[PDB]
Tab-separated table of C-alpha atoms and ligand atoms in Angstrom:
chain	number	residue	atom	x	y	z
A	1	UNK	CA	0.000	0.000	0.000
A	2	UNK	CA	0.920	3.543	-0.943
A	3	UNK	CA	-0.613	7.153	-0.900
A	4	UNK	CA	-1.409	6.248	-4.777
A	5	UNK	CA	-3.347	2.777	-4.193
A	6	UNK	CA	-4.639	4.583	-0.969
A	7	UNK	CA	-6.425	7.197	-3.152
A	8	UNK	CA	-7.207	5.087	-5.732
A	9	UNK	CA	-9.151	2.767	-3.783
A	10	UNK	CA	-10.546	5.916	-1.721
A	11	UNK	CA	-11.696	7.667	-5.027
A	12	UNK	CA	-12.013	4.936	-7.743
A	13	UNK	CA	-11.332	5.508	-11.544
A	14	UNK	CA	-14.122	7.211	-14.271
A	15	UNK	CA	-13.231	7.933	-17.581
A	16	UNK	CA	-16.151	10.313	-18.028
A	17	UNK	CA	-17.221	13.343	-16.598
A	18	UNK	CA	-19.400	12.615	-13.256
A	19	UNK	CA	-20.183	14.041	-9.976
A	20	UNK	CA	-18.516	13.884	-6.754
A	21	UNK	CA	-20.057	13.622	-3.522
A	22	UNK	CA	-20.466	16.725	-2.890
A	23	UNK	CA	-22.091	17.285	-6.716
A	24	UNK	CA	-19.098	18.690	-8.522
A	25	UNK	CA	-18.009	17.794	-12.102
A	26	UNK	CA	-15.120	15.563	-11.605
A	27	UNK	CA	-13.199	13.351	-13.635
A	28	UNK	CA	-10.076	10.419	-13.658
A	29	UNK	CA	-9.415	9.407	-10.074
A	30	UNK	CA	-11.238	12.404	-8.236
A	31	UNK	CA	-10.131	15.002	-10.543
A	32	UNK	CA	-11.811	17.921	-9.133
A	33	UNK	CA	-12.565	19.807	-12.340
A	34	UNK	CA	-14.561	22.976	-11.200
A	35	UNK	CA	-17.394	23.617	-9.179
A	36	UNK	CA	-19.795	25.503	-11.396
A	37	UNK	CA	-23.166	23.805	-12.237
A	38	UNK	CA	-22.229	24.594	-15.595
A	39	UNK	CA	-21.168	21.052	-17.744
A	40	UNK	CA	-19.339	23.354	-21.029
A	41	UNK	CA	-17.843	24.703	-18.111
A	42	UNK	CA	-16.626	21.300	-16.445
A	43	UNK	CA	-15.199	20.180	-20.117
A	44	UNK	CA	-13.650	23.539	-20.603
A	45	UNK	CA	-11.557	22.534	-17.761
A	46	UNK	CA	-11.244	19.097	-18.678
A	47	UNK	CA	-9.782	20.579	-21.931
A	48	UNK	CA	-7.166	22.714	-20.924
A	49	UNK	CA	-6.351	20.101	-18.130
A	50	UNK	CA	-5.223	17.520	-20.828
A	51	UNK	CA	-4.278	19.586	-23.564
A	52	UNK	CA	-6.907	18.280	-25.971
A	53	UNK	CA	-10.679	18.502	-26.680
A	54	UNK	CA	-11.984	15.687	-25.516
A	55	UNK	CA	-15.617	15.965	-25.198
A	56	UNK	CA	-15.379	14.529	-21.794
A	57	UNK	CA	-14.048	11.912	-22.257
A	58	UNK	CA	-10.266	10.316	-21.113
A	59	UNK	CA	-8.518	7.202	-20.946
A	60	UNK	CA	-7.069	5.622	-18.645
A	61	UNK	CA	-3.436	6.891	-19.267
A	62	UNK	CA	-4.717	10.320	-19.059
A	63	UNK	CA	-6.719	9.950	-16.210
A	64	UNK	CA	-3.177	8.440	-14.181
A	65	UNK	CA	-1.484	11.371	-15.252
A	66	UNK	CA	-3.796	13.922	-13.676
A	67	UNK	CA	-3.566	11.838	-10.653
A	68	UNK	CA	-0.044	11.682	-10.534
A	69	UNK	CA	-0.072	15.744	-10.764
A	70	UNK	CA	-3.069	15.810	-8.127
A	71	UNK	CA	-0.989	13.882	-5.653
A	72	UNK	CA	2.627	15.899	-6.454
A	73	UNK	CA	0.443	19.218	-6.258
A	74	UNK	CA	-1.230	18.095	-2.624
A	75	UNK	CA	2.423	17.008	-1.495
A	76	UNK	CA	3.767	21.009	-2.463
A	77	UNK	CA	0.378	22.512	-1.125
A	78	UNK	CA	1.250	20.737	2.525
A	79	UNK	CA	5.080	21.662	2.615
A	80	UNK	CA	4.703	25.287	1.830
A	81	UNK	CA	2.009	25.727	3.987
A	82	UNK	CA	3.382	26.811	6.992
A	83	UNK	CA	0.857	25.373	9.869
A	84	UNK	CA	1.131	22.017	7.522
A	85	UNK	CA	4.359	21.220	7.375
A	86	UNK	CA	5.869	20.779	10.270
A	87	UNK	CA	3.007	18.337	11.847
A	88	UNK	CA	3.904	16.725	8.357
A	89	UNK	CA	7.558	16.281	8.812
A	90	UNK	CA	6.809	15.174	12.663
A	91	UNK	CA	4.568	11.859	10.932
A	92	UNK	CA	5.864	8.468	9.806
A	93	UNK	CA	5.437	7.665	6.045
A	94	UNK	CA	1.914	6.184	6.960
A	95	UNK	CA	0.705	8.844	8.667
A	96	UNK	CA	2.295	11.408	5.794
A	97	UNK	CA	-0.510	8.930	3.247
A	98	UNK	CA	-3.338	9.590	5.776
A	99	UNK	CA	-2.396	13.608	5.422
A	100	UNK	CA	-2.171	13.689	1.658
A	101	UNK	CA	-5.432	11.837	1.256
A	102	UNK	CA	-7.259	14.486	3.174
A	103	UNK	CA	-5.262	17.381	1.465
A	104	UNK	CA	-6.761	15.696	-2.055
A	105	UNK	CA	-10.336	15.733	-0.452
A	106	UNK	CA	-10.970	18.922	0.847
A	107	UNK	CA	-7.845	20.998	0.224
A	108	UNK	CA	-5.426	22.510	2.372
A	109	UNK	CA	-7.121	25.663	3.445
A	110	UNK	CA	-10.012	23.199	4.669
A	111	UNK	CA	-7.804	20.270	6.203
A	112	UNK	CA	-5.045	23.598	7.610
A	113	UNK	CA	-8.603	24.582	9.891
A	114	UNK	CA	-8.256	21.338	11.624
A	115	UNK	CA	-6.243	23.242	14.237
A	116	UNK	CA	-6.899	21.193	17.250
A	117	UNK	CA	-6.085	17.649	15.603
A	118	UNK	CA	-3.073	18.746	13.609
A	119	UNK	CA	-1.944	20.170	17.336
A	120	UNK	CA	-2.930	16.163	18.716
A	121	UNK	CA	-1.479	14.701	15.450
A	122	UNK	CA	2.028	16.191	16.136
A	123	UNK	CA	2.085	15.725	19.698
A	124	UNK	CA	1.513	12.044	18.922
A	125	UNK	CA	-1.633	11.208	20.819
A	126	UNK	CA	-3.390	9.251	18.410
A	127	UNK	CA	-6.595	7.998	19.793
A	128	UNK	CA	-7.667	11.618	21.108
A	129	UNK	CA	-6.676	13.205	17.687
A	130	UNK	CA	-9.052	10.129	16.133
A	131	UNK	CA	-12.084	11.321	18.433
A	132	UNK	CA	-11.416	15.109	17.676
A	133	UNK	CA	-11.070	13.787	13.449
A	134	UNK	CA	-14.379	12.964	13.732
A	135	UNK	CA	-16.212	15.564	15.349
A	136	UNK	CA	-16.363	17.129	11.589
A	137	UNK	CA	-18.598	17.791	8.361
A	138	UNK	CA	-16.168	15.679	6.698
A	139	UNK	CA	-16.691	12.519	9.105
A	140	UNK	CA	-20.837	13.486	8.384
A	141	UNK	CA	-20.352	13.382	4.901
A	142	UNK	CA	-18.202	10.514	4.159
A	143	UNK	CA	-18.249	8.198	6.881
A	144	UNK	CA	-16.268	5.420	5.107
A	145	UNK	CA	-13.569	6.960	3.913
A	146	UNK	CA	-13.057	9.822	6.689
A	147	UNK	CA	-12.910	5.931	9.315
A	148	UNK	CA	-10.277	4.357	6.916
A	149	UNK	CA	-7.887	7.562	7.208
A	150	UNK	CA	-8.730	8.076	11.140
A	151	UNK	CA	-7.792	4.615	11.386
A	152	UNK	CA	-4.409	5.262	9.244
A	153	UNK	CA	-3.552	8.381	11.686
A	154	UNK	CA	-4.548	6.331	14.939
A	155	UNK	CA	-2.548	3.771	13.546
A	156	UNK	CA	0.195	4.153	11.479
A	157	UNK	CA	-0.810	1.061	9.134
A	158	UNK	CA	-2.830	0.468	6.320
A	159	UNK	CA	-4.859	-2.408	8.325
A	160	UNK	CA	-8.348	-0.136	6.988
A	161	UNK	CA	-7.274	-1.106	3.318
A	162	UNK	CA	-6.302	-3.916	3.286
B	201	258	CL1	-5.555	17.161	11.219
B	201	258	C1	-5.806	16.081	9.819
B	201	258	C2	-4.801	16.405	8.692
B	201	258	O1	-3.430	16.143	9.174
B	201	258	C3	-2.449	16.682	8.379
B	201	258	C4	-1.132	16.705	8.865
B	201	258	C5	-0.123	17.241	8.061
B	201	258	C6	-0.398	17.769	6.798
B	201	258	C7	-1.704	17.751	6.309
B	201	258	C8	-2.717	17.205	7.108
């Protein structure tokens, strides 16, 4: 297991344009393309993400590549953000997969407002920063998934994925 088969599993694989969870045109492995109700506007994106017009449509290559940028991109969001990055550096490799997952969900401004977890994440006290986890609109929303990575962070394995 690895923050790529973590994801993948966590946000499966469409070749065409569909909606997340929360209702927002999306493509690939949870390729967040915009979140106007607007589908011209979804594949304009989709477009100028791949370099081609593709009527909303990609294969599977293209959809890896994306992902592959998604996950680089979430990894560069966390280390220059400044509240972040050092509860980052303080996790274990596992822990660093349960991080980048929610960083891909909800983005870094959202998961960076998770003030009094990150402060129980670095301090290492991993069944209280579990509770506080899921005392959130993300746990609410999706259950599943927000268990598997509290379980990851409580952890430190990849027992929830296997
Ligand atoms: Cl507090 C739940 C998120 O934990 C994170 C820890 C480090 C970087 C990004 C996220």
């Amino acid at each position: 297991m690895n923050i790529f088969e973590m994801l993948r599993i966590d946000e499966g694989l469409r070749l065409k344009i569909y909606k997340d969870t929360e209702g927002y045109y999306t493509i690939g492995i949870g390729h967040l393309l915009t979140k106007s109700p607007s589908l011209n506007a979804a594949k304009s994106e989709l477009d100028k993400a791949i370099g081609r017009n593709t009527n909303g449509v990609i294969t599977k290559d293209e959809a890896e590549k994306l992902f592959n940028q998604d996950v680089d991109a979430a990894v560069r969001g966390i280390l220059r953000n400044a509240k972040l990055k050092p509860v980052y550096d303080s996790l274990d490799a596992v822990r660093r997969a349960a991080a980048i997952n929610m960083v891909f969900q909800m983005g870094e401004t959202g998961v960076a407002g998770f003030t009094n977890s990150l402060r129980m994440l670095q301090q290492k006290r991993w069944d209280e920063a579990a509770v506080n986890l899921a005392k959130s609109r993300w746990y609410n929303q999706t259950p599943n998934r927000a268990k598997r990575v509290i379980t990851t962070f409580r952890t430190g394995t990849w027992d929830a994925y296997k």
